[PDB]
Design a protein around this nucleic acid. Structure first.
Ligand SMILES: [Mg+2]
Ligand SMILES: [Zn+2]
Ligand SMILES: [Zn+2]
Ligand SMILES: [Zn+2]
Lengths: 61, 147, 67, 57, 113, 48, 45, 56, 263, 49
RNA sequence: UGCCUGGUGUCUUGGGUGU
């Protein structure tokens, strides 16, 4: 397989990916980074949506 | 004169026993457009100036596998670098040296068990391996202790 | 890392008393009384259970490398 | 520091990995057993062996 | 690395005799006995048993080095008695003492069982 | 050319009965086998 | 020819010395070799 | 091992394989094609073996 | 002439008093019980799979220290003295352990009760790991979480505590004589008064304290010895005592045979 | 973009606090490899002047 | 008869060991 084919297969399985702890942690980190970016831009509307999404994704055990 | 006497039976039961890890690193260097190093198990025929150790513990990809006991001077990473061929193509039946050995031997005074082998790619996209060796060190005459 | 099988000094088997020791401490017994109830008389044995730190509970929190 | 810091001993082969000294010679060497290390040099000739055994003993 | 094998403390090589006896000519009727793969357990027992015999005038032992498992014993008896006979008598006497001790312990254990 | 070199071997007699090793030296009638159990190498006759 | 294990999802696979060093299913860049099939014996001392 | 390959769609075309009828006598079926079905992820071999490929 | 008097008796410890024996004989008996009575212990571990967080040799060392029942170890032979190729049933006992955690939550404890005896000498009561009761789980060996498995095969051999401390049947042998110091074998350090600064021995009531007007007796020797033998469970206390006596007798008999064959 | 990146990386990697071509006369030893022999050693190293 | 191999950077720097 080529590198591009590997990336395509990984994206396909990510679309198929229901949940994975490593991927959930990565998604939460990316969401936190996006939230701080929105905070620095004084966007009070996006930050509410990002906070709601973070609350929904979180609550681990 | 600052010596001490230790109980042998306590040492046998695990007193002050410890675990030792050492890691080795190696990577494939790029010297030109198509001059690259390769992780492989070098053969006595196609390569020249081999290390005096043993290459029989290497796998097909030139990397030792975890769980294998190793001794000093054994080869844990097999790497070869290309060399411009000589006039041996005169009458050699493909048995002419085209590569030079650049293998990584275990340290002469150390031995243990291969604990974990890591294979990945560096920033430049070339192969990159790390081999971790594990051994146990039991207290003996000459070891330093302190309160 | 995990409770030693034998006491270093004398050799009494203390590796089977960790769970009982924790159960006794759970019920409110003092450490000295808990060690006495397990029939650990010599202080060489008492230091083995008293000063043991259980680190395997921290190593087990890492996701296993195989499946 | 002085010429008593180099003296010639007689070899006795023993197990384990440390040099072993009678404790009376720890004074001229200014040595104790808390981690010190010492150097051993082997003569390679009959003349040199005789010099060591007759002068530096 | 240089640590010897632990079984060398008690396993006897084929070429090494367990018990070598050489006379001590400096004093009359004295022998020097070299025990291989033995330690204070047998030596002290034998020494304190032999010290009580009226015909034994000198008995001693020493372990030259703790890192080697052997000891050497010096025995010296009266004119009438050969030292090796005294050593044999000591061994037999200690064996009888141990035998009666075992019998009495078994009796007591059965009584208190 | 010493076909038993670099081959896994097991000891059947002596003080190392039942220990797995690898043959390192095969001069003759005295094989050097490194032991997997401790970190040491020992001589051993071929019959063992 | 030789097995490998991913560093994140612990998925077993194999490589042919020509594929890119990558987990097939999660695309992780770090993989580990699998344990040898030889016998491992210890002296219990 | 190979269902996610782009060429696997044409590879599986026309192949003959043993099939569990379910309604069990195993029988052979002819592959008329494949069709990816989103939202129909199913366990293929284990719980983690989610698959969206379908065989017509 | 020698006498034995038992104070307390149990399966694991016996407290007895020896009398009319030399101090050397009692000390040699103590040393023999400590380091020369043969027992059975795991000596080789073949690790077929170990995905736990503990190192392989860590678990091997832990296994070697587990006490195994060694009642009939006399019938068993030493590994180096058995002519059989490899190990037979007459010089080794094979135990096998297999542990695994099922489910994606919780932690599984691996106990010594999981060690299962596979092969051994016929009808000999050896090899089984020692258990305090029928419901005692035993020594904690390891811990496992999901998808971690431990699968090993262990071989037990006969040996003595001189070679390694794992073959020692006894834990600690308390040994004591002359509680009231009538022989003056020790000189008591003190600040004000040596009598009230030193705790009484636990056997002080078993001997009459010296009279205030009594003179020193230079003809006396230590005569009564108090010793407690504690075992790890592999051997009973009476078995340890009797086998120590027998081992001492065998050693002396070997010396006697060497002397008689020397001529 | 290579200027700042290489300068910072070189100074942090080697400990020479300055430009690469002015290694002499620059203050050396500013950056050191973290001591990870034991936890206390790491804590001590992180609070050193 | 298919037949066996010794050859190991340099320069800086930093942290340590024993006096
Ligand atoms: Mg010093
Ligand atoms: Zn203790
Ligand atoms: Zn993966
Ligand atoms: Zn046998």
């Amino acid at each position: 397989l080529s590198n591009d084919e590997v990336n395509s297969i990984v994206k396909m399985k990510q679309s198929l990916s229901s949940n994975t702890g490593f991927n959930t942690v990565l998604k939460k980190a990316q969401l936190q980074e996006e939230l701080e970016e929105a905070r620095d831009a004084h966007d009070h509307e996006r930050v509410a949506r990002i906070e709601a999404e973070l609350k929904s994704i979180g609550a681990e055990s | 004169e600052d010596s001490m006497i230790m109980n042998q039976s306590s040492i046998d039961r695990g007193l002050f026993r410890s675990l030792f890890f050492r890691s080795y690193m190696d990577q494939e260097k790029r010297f030109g457009i198509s001059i690259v190093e390769e992780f492989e198990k070098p053969t006595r025929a196609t390569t020249l100036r081999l290390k005096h150790g043993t290459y029989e513990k290497l796998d097909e990809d030139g990397l030792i596998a975890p769980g294998v006991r190793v001794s000093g001077d054994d080869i844990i990473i097999g790497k070869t670098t290309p060399i411009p061929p000589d006039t041996e193509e005169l009458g050699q039946r493909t048995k002419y040296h085209t590569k030079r050995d650049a293998s990584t031997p275990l340290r002469s005074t150390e031995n243990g068990i291969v604990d974990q082998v890591l294979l990945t790619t560096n920033q430049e996209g070339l192969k990159f391996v790390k081999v971790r060796m594990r051994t146990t060190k039991v207290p003996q005459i000459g070891d330093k202790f302190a309160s | 890392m995990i409770i030693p099988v034998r006491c270093f000094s004398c050799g009494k088997v203390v590796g089977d008393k960790w769970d009982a020791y924790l159960r006794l401490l759970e019920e409110g017994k003092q450490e000295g009384d808990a060690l006495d109830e397990l029939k650990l008389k010599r202080y060489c044995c008492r230091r083995m259970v008293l000063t043991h730190v259980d680190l395997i509970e921290k190593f087990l929190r890492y996701n296993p490398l195989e499946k | 520091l002085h010429k008593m810091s180099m003296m010639a001993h007689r070899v006795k082969v023993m197990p384990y990995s440390t040099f072993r000294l009678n404790l009376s010679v720890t004074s001229p060497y200014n040595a104790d057993f808390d981690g010190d290390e010492m150097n051993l040099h082997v003569p390679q000739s009959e003349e040199t062996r005789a010099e060591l055994s007759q002068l530096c003993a | 690395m240089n640590a010897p094998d632990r079984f060398e403390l008690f396993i006897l090589p084929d070429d090494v005799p367990k018990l070598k006896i050489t006379p001590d000519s400096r004093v009359p009727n004295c022998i020097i006995i070299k025990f291989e793969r033995e330690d204070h357990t047998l030596a002290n027992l034998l020494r304190e048993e032999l010290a009580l015999y009226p015909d034994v005038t000198f008995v001693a032992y020493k372990v030259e080095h703790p890192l080697f498992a052997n000891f050497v014993m010096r025995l010296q008896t009266e004119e009438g008695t050969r030292p090796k006979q005294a050593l044999e008598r000591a061994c037999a006497s200690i064996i009888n003492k141990l035998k009666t001790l075992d019998h009495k312990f078994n009796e007591e254990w059965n009584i208190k069982n | 050319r010493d076909p038993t070199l670099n081959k896994t071997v097991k000891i059947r007699q002596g003080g190392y009965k039942g220990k797995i090793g690898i043959v390192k030296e095969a001069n003759g009638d005295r094989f050097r086998v490194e032991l997997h159990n401790p970190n040491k190498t020992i001589p051993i006759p071929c019959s063992f | 020819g030789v097995k490998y294990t991913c560093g994140a999802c612990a998925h077993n696979f194999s490589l042919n010395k020509s594929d890119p060093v990558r987990c097939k299913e999660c695309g992780h860049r770090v993989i580990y070799k699998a344990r040898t099939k030889r016998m491992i014996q210890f002296d219990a001392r | 091992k190979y269902w996610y390959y782009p060429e696997f769609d044409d590879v599986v075309k026309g192949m003959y394989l043993r099939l569990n009828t379910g309604s069990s006598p195993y029988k052979v079926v002819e592959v008329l094609g494949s069709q990816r079905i989103k939202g129909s992820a199913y366990g293929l071999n284990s719980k983690e073996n989610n698959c969206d490929m379908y065989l017509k | 002439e020698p006498k034995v008097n038992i104070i307390n008796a149990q399966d694991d410890e016996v407290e007895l008093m020896l009398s009319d024996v030399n101090l050397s004989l009692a000390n040699s008996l103590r040393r023999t019980m400590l380091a020369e009575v043969p027992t059975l212990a795991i000596d080789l571990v073949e690790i077929k799979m170990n995905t736990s967080v503990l190192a392989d040799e860590f678990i091997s060392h832990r296994l070697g220290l587990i006490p195994l029942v060694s009642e009939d170890v006399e019938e068993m032979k030493y590994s180096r003295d058995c002519t059989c190729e490899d190990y037979c049933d007459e010089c080794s006992v094979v135990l096998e352990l297999s542990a695994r955690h099922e489910g994606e939550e919780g932690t599984t404890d691996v106990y010594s009760s999981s060690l299962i005896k596979v092969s051994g000498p016929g009808n000999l009561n050896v090899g089984e790991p020692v258990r305090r009761d029928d419901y005692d789980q035993g020594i904690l060996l390891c811990k496992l979480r999901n998808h971690q498995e431990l699968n090993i095969r262990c071989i037990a051999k006969k040996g003595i505590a001189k070679e390694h401390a794992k073959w020692s049947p006894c834990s600690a042998i308390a040994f004591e004589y002359d509680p009231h110091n009538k022989l003056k074998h020790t000189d008591f350090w003190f600040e004000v008064d040596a009598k009230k600064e030193w705790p009484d021995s636990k056997y002080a009531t078993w001997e009459e304290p010296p009279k205030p007007g009594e003179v020193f007796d230079y003809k006396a020797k230590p005569n009564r010895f108090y010793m407690t033998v504690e075992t790890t469970g592999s051997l009973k206390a009476n078995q340890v005592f009797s086998r120590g006596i027998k081992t001492l007798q065998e050693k002396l008999a070997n010396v006697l045979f060497e002397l008689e064959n020397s001529r | 973009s290579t200027t700042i990146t290489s300068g910072l990386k070189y100074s942090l990697a080697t400990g020479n606090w300055g430009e690469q071509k002015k290694a002499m006369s620059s203050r050396a030893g500013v950056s050191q490899v973290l001591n990870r022999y034991t936890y206390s050693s790491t804590l001590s190293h992180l609070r050193r002047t």
